[PDB]
CSV table of N, CA and C in Angstrom, one decimal:
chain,number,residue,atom,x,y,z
A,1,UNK,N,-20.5,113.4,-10.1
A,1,UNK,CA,-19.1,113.2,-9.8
A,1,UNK,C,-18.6,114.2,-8.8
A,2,UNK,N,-17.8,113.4,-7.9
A,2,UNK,CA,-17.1,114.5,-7.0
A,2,UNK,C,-16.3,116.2,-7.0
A,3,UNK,N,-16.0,115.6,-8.8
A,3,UNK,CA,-15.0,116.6,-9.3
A,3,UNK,C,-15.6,117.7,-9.6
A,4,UNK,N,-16.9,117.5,-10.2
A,4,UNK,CA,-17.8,118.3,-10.8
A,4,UNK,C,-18.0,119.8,-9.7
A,5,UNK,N,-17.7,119.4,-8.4
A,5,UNK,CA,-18.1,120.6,-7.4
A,5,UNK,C,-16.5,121.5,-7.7
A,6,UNK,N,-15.5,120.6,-7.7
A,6,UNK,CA,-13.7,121.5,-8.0
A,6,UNK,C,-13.9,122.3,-9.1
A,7,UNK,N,-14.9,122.3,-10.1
A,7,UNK,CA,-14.7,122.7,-11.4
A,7,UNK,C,-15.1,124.9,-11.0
A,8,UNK,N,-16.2,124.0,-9.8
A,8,UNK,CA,-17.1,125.6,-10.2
A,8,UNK,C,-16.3,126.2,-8.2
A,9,UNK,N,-15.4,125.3,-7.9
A,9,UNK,CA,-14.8,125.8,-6.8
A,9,UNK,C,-13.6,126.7,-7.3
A,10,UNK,N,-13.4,126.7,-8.8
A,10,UNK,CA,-11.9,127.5,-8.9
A,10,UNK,C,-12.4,128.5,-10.0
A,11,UNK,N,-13.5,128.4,-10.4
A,11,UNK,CA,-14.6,129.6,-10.9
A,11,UNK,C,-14.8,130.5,-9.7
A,12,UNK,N,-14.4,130.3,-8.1
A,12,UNK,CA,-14.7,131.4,-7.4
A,12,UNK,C,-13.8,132.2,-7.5
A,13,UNK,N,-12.7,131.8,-7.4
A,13,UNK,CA,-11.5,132.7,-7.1
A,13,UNK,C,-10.1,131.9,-7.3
């Protein structure tokens, strides 16, 4: 799923 990449994008910062 597309979303799956948002999850570990707001795990950066």
């Amino acid at each position: 799923g597309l979303s799956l990449l948002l999850s570990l994008g707001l795990k950066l910062l």
